[PDB]
Every structure is written in C-alpha cells, then in structure tokens.
Amino acid sequence: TVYCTFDHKLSLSDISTLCKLMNIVIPIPAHHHLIGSGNLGLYPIVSSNKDYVHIRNVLRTMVVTILQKVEGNQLVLRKPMTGQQYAIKNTGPFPWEKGDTLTLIPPLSTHSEEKLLKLGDWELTVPLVVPTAIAAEINIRLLCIGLIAVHREYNEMQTIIDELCSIQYRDVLIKLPDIVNDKQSMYSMKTACISLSMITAMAPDIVRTYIDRLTLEDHSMLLIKCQELLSLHATDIKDELKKIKSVLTMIDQINSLTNEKTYFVVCDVSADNRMATCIYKN
Amino acid sequence: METVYCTFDHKLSLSDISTLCKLMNIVIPIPAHHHLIGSGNLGLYPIVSSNKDYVHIRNVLRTMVVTILQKVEGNQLVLRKPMTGQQYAIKNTGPFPWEKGDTLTLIPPLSTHSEEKLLKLGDWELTVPLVVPTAIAAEINIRLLCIGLIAVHREYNEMQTIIDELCSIQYRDVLIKLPDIVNDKQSMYSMKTACISLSMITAMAPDIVRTYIDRLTLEDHSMLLIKCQELLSKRTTLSTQRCGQLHATDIKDELKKIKSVLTMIDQINSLTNEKTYFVVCDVSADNRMATCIYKN
Amino acid sequence: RENLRIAARVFTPCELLAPELENLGMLMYRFETDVDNPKILFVGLFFLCSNAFNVSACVRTALTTMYTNSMVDNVLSMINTCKYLEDKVSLFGVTSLVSCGSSCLLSCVMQGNVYDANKENIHGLTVLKEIFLEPDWEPRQHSTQYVYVVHVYKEVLSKLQYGIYVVLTSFQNEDLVVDILRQYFEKERFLFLNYLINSNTTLSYFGSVQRIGRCATEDIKSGFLQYRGITLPVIKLENIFVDLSEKKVFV
Amino acid sequence: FAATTNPWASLPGSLGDILYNTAHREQLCYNPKTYSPNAQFFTESDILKTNKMMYKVINEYCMKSNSCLNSDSEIQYSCSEGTDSFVSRPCQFLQN
Amino acid sequence: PRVATGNDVTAPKETTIMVAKHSEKHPINISFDLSAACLEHLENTFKN
Numbered sequence: 001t002v003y004c005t006f007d008h009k010l011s012l013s014d015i016s017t018l019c020k021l022m023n024i025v026i027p028i029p030a031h032h033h034l035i036g037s038g039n040l041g042l043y044p045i046v047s048s049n050k051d052y053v054h055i056r057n058v059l060r061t062m063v064v065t066i067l068q069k070v071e072g073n074q075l076v077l078r079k080p081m082t083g084q085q086y087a088i089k090n091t092g093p094f095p096w097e098k099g100d101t102l103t104l105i106p107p108l109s110t111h112s113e114e115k116l117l118k119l120g121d122w123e124l125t126v127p128l129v130v131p132t133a134i135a136a137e138i139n140i141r142l143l144c145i146g147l148i149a150v151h152r153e154y155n156e157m158q159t160i161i162d163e164l165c166s167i168q169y170r171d172v173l174i175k176l177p178d179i180v181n182d183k184q185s186m187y188s189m190k191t192a193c194i195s196l197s198m199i200t201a202m203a204p205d206i207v208r209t210y211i212d213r214l215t216l217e218d219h220s221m222l223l224i225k226c227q228e229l230l231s232l233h234a235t236d237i238k239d240e241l242k243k244i245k246s247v248l249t250m251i252d253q254i255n256s257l258t259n260e261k262t263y264f265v266v267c268d269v270s271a272d273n274r275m276a277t278c279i280y281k282n
Numbered sequence: 283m284e285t286v287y288c289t290f291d292h293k294l295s296l297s298d299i300s301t302l303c304k305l306m307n308i309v310i311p312i313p314a315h316h317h318l319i320g321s322g323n324l325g326l327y328p329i330v331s332s333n334k335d336y337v338h339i340r341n342v343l344r345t346m347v348v349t350i351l352q353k354v355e356g357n358q359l360v361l362r363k364p365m366t367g368q369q370y371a372i373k374n375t376g377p378f379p380w381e382k383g384d385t386l387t388l389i390p391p392l393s394t395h396s397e398e399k400l401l402k403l404g405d406w407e408l409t410v411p412l413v414v415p416t417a418i419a420a421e422i423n424i425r426l427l428c429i430g431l432i433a434v435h436r437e438y439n440e441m442q443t444i445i446d447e448l449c450s451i452q453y454r455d456v457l458i459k460l461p462d463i464v465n466d467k468q469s470m471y472s473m474k475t476a477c478i479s480l481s482m483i484t485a486m487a488p489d490i491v492r493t494y495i496d497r498l499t500l501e502d503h504s505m506l507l508i509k510c511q512e513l514l515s516k517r518t519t520l521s522t523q524r525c526g527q528l529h530a531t532d533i534k535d536e537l538k539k540i541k542s543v544l545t546m547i548d549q550i551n552s553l554t555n556e557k558t559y560f561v562v563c564d565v566s567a568d569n570r571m572a573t574c575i576y577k578n
Numbered sequence: 579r580e581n582l583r584i585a586a587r588v589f590t591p592c593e594l595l596a597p598e599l600e601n602l603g604m605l606m607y608r609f610e611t612d613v614d615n616p617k618i619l620f621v622g623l624f625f626l627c628s629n630a631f632n633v634s635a636c637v638r639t640a641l642t643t644m645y646t647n648s649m650v651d652n653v654l655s656m657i658n659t660c661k662y663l664e665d666k667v668s669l670f671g672v673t674s675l676v677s678c679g680s681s682c683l684l685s686c687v688m689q690g691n692v693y694d695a696n697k698e699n700i701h702g703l704t705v706l707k708e709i710f711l712e713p714d715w716e717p718r719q720h721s722t723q724y725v726y727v728v729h730v731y732k733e734v735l736s737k738l739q740y741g742i743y744v745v746l747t748s749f750q751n752e753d754l755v756v757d758i759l760r761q762y763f764e765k766e767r768f769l770f771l772n773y774l775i776n777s778n779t780t781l782s783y784f785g786s787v788q789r790i791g792r793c794a795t796e797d798i799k800s801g802f803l804q805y806r807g808i809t810l811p812v813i814k815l816e817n818i819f820v821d822l823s824e825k826k827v828f829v
Numbered sequence: 830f831a832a833t834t835n836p837w838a839s840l841p842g843s844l845g846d847i848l849y850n851t852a853h854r855e856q857l858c859y860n861p862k863t864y865s866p867n868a869q870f871f872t873e874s875d876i877l878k879t880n881k882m883m884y885k886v887i888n889e890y891c892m893k894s895n896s897c898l899n900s901d902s903e904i905q906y907s908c909s910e911g912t913d914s915f916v917s918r919p920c921q922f923l924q925n
Numbered sequence: 926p927r928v929a930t931g932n933d934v935t936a937p938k939e940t941t942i943m944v945a946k947h948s949e950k951h952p953i954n955i956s957f958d959l960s961a962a963c964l965e966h967l968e969n970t971f972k973n
Binding site for chain 2: 082083098099100101136140143144147148150151153156159160164189190193194196197198199200201202203204206207208209210211213214217223226229230231233234235237240241244245247248251252254255258259266267
Binding site: 897898902903904 | 940942943944945946947
C-alpha cells in the first residue's frame, strides 16, 4: 500500500474525476509507503525530451501500482502481488478481447487534450495498457523508423512516415508523431544486424533449398508473393539439428528485441468493457 | 471462482468413470471463454483437427488456461486452476520419466491415430498436451521442423532412412517414434506457415544486412562492419555476381523488406520459446505422480 | 503452525560436498549423467567455479585443494567432456540441512526463505567475491535487489571455458537486464560471433541469465569462508526469497 | 422434380464450391476478417457436422419422446444443441 | 393410476416406476469490500 498526498486541496470536480478514474495502473519510481504529487504518474519524466522510446525504457524501469479508494486528497495505491487477481479500468482505445496478455505502453499523444488532471504545473500522465500484439507492432514500427531514418533522403522521410505511422488494429487508428531519431533504434537494430548476419552464416542448406523445392513442386499465391520478395544431403543430420537450433536462437533474440513484457492476463471482462480482471504480476 | 465445474453432455459409462478415476490428476487446457459444457472447449479437442496450422496449435496452447483435474463428482468435473508459486500434484502422462528439479512444459500431443483416445463420447474426444521436460521440448520442436523441411524434398534415395533417423529419439532410456512419417497426414501438422516463415527469415537476412552494412561506416564502427564482412563472406563467399537489378533499389523497397522480415519473426513467436509451466520439486514412488510447483 | 517454504530432500555422495557440508547456504547444481545408477548428481557452486574462467589462479588452486579427490576428478572430466554446460548441468536451489551420512542427505529450497525448521538462524546465499559484479546505472539503487546468475562462455582456441557470474540489480525486467548485460559483455560476444560459425559443438548462444530471487540492500555483508584454514573472501547475502525463473539466453 | 437445379454449385469442383469451400481455400490465403455468409453452405466438414448433429439429436429427442410413466428411467436434458442451433438456424438446417 | 376394464382383462401391472435424476452443482460468490477506519471505529465503541 502506497498512500499519495498532494498537499493541495482538490475540488468536487477533481474528486468526481478521480472517482471516474478509480482502479487504474499508475507507475511510481519511489517504492515507499508514502508518495506525493512529485513522484505520482509519468509527468515527472515527460518534460525531458518527450522521446517515446525514452519514456518506454524508464517505464520498463518503473514500479506499477493500482489506484484504489480515493479519500479526498489521500489516494491509495495497492502494490499488486504476483499472480493474484486484480480489477483494472482501461484507458487504451481498444475493444479488449478477453484472455489476451497485456503490456503497459507510453501514452500515445492524441490530438484532444487530456481531461484526467491538470493542476498547478502538474498533470496526471497515465500510461496506457495495450495488448501484447499491438505492443509488439508498435515496437516493430519503432525499429523500422530507425532502419529507414539511418538512411538519408530529402522529402522521403515524410513519405515513409505518413504511410507507415497510421496503423489500424481492431478498428482503431493510432499514430506516433515527431520521432527525434535517436540512436536507440541504432543499438536495438545493431544486435538485430548482428543476428541477421548470424542467420546468414549459420542458416542450413535445407532451408533456402526448401523454398525452391516447395515452389518447383507446388504453388500458391502467397508463395508467388514470397517469390516476388525472393527475386546431395548425405547424412549431416546432427549438423542440421545444430544449425537449425542456432537459427531458432537468433530468431528468439530478434523476437526478444521487439517483444514487450506482458504485465496482465485477462479473465473476466465487463459488458461496458471499462473494467476487466487479471491474474498476473511479473 | 477458484475452481471450475464442467458438466458432460451425456451420462458416463462404467468404463468411462473408471477412465476418469485413472486420470484423476491431469492438466487440461481451457480457453478464456468459460464454457460450462464438459464436451466443448476442454482438452483442446475443438482446436486441433478443426483449425490446424501447428503455429496456431502452439500459439493457442501457449495462450490457453491450464487447469488440473481434482475430483470427479457423479456428473461434473472439478477443475482447479493453479495459482502461481504454489504447489500442486500432477499424475504422469508423458512417456518420459520425471526427475526432481526438472522444468516441465506442455507440448501438443504427437497425435497419431492409433492412440486409445481416452474419452470418446459421440464424436467428441479428449486429447491432452504432453507434460514433458524443456530440453525434450526444444529437441522435439527441432526434429519436427527437420521432418517438415525434408518431407517436401524430392529424389533422395536415402529419404526413408533419414526420416527414420529423425523419428528415432532417445532420452533416459525411453524411446519414442515421431509420428511424422512419409506424409499420410493423419496428423502431420503440416507446419507450412512455420517452414515458409523460417525460410523467409533465412532468405531475407543477407540482403537486408547487406543494404545496412553498405552504409555509414565513415566513423570507426570496427565491431560490426568487418565482423559482418567475415560473417557474410564465409557463407556467401562469391557475393553479388549477376546482381539481378544491378543495384537500383527503392527506399520503400527496403522499407517493405524490413517490415516483412520483422513481421515473420513475430509470426514465429510461437516456436520462439517454451515456458516452464511446472517446476517439479519431488517425484513420488514408481513415477506415477509427482508434486510440483506452478509457474507462468 | 505455518511454513510456506518449498524444499526437496536430496541424496548425493559425500565426496563432492567438501566445504559445503559445513557452511549452510550454497547454490546447488543438477548434473544428469549417462551412467544409469546415479542418474542425477549434485554439484557445488564453488565446485563448478573451479573451472570457471573468471576465477583467478590463486583462488582457483586454493579451492582445487579444497576439491581434490578421485570422484571429483572423474566428475570434472565428465563436465569437461560435455559439449556445452548449461543444460547438462543446471541450477537447482539453495543448500540447507546437510546431514553428512554415508551418502549425504541435503535439503534444498526451491521457493521461500532458507530455513530448515523452527525458523531459528535463517541462512543466506554465499557467493564467492570474485564471481559477482553489479552492472547498473547506480549501484544499490534505492531498495531490494534481484539476484541473477549468469553463465558466460569463452573460447581460448582449443575448447570452451565457461564462466560463472552473479549480478545484483534493482531491475526486475529481464529485457532491461539483458540489455545492460550486452553492454557489459560485448567484447567476448564479438569473439563468439567469430566462433559459433566454425564451431560444430551444439550450442547457440553466448550466455544465459536466470533469476535466483530477492535480496535486501541492507542485508549484504562481507566476510570469508574457511575450510582447512583456506581463507576465501565471500559476500554473504543474508535473507533471500528464492524465486527461480526461466533461463533467458543471449548471443 | 429435377435432380439438381444448378450444376454450378451442386457439383464437386464447381466454381461456387471451390470459391466458398474451405477444403479448396487452403491454396489461397485470404483476409479472414471478410465473413462469407456462403462459407457455411458449401464446405464439406461443416455440413457433415451439422447433418450428424441434427440426426443424432433428433435421435436423442426420439429417445426422450415417451413419458417416463411408460418409457424407461432416463434423465431429460436439452443438451445445449438448441443453443448451438440458434446462430445456425439456416445453417443447422442448411436451408438458407 | 389404473382404469379397470372388466370386459376381457384388467391390465394387472403394479406400475411403480423409479425415475433417476442427476444433480447439478453451482456456487455463487460475492466480493464485499469493507473499510479500515470504518472497521476500527465501529469496533472500538469508545464513547470518549
């Protein structure tokens, strides 16, 4: 239990907004029994350069809590234990099909201003909760923006970004503007580049043959699309096992790049789909 | 709440109640949608043999809620779902022996159609995932991928004996034959999305890494540049002879190549890892059941 | 009463546990064996830190003199003739209740704090001082740290040499930990990007990290162990909620 | 009075059956979000499933037809087949 | 119940039927929050 106290008296509109906002994950860095206005939420970091991946890294470092039982200016945050059941109100604009794993993502800046809190040069920046599929999708897009923006053209950076950025998952359009192009993608691409070099050097003889053998036997239309992208074996089988194991491990590494740690596992969903129950903590 | 009650559609025979009493502890995967019928959405019968991909099978088996049988009533199944970090008891189903401290996991059943098919109640049956150690799970994954790769391959006069040497595995003096034979497709699982995606990764890697390493080394990288020169030059010693297009590529082309090669990895996310569903603490006598703890 | 800790009774021949029959709280390793009568055989952390490459020659020969008999010589030969290390030996837990019989009985804790019974003198994990390092942005950041064990290999032109590291970090996230470990380990990593192609031994990575469990920041204290007068500097974690997780490899 | 009134969907391998059958859909990947209403009519496995469900369950209710004052001792239960038929009222019956 | 004919034969059966019926089980849960302070002051009953 972490009690928050803002030291500043809030109005009835503020207590109505927090009553609307009850049962939401808020991350804290402090790990004390007491927190205040300075450490609550994500505003004490989102003034430093506003970089999405920077917020993502420190948000990985943060310690997550659940809002509970606001008694006026005092604000209970439960520290939720491992694998126990907890009720979460959602903020991500999604339809939230049950049983999927959930991660915790930096807030994608919508054009409309937030109505959560703005009080005395301090807002309540709440990070969103998303499914792991669209989380990995966003991380793919981050890595891809760096792969393209290491390459340099004039009036083509905008041509890549405006086509790529607006994505749709479960009838929801989101976008990520103003990428600073830091070297974050360069390191997290550099180990990918290393691993793709290893996939090249360690990939077996069966597999790139397996394309041509599959195509020369039979054909399918998605195989013809893969062909568009494309354009003796005398008992070496333990070597083949080892090479396929190495290629699989490189794919595990590049998957561990774009993967985000699942923070929640959904069991029951309300019909309004504002609150859902989970049984997980990392 | 803590437990789950399933109700069978039909009454149970005497041999069927005897089968459930033989199987009174087992893992059962259930989907997230709580279906109260004891014939629908339990044991994963509705997922294999109705929608089969072997990446879909591995994905859904990863995402399903494991739940262990506890007690059989006169009509209903009592199914307790595990809490993480606590002890439970598992009766042994897999062929491979359990020893103490082993990490356990759930692989899909090697579904030859010669099994005894534990329940068979009017076109509905019960197939359980095999509780198996983790090194075995990696090994069986790689052997199944090897069979699915070399099965499509033609004009090998050694094809029957190399499929035999793939299907023969051995681990702690318990042999099993892998059912991925000469492609009867009883349950071959067909692994076509998996094999095409693996070969797209091993296909798209060298030219995307070539288009990157041909760029921006005016500073001393000297840790990736010459390293990737050696890495590319071992496997492809003769590099870029005919050139295909003679080096006229698009920024959108490299965009699409990067996006596809990063999408296929998160498609083969299912064959990426295996999670330790159980860490067995002690093994009971005669290796028929074992008390374990639950993780993930 | 109440316990809530998870233990396992253990039979191991008494030759291998030479100082670890005296100082309670040590990491233990499972070593499966193709010999069918001892299917599993249990290995001391310091016993494998013998042929770890991090350990300097003085500490290595000192604990080799703590670790010289015929049975240990044969077991070290078996470990060296194993191709890789990390899945022929394996992490197992923390020592409590040495019995020292003929074939000695060991309790070993999987989860929870390290205590036999009656909850007097709750023991702690004992790590050799050479074999750990804390790569982090700020050392001992705010509060309690997660303790991980990392196996790292090295290749000096003949064979593979394994190396045993222990990291202590405030980061819980395994992705953040492997991202700071690649920054620590990049040099020998590029050496293995050279090596793993020309190698034919079945391995696929540079190292792997696995969580032991929680510690407490104010409960880290220095000291030494001594067996037959061999003073050996150790850093003793005091109260440990043992929380094993999966192995996470990195190349 | 005619045998079939269409040889372009009643025949095996006709254009309708190949276009809207799942057994011949395996050679062509597609957007799964496009819900075909005719994908419940031409597919072999699903119409076999509906025919055997309807036949076995009309057999069930014919077992349960007679009163227990005259028939034997047996429980009576709807067996959720009606709930499986609600969505599929032109698809259990295949009637369109 | 039985209806006596009297013409040719009365249907002589006892007609006692056993009817086996199974039992379904179903539990019902509540959460029921409370409060620390509400619990402490109500419990104390100190009229100081």
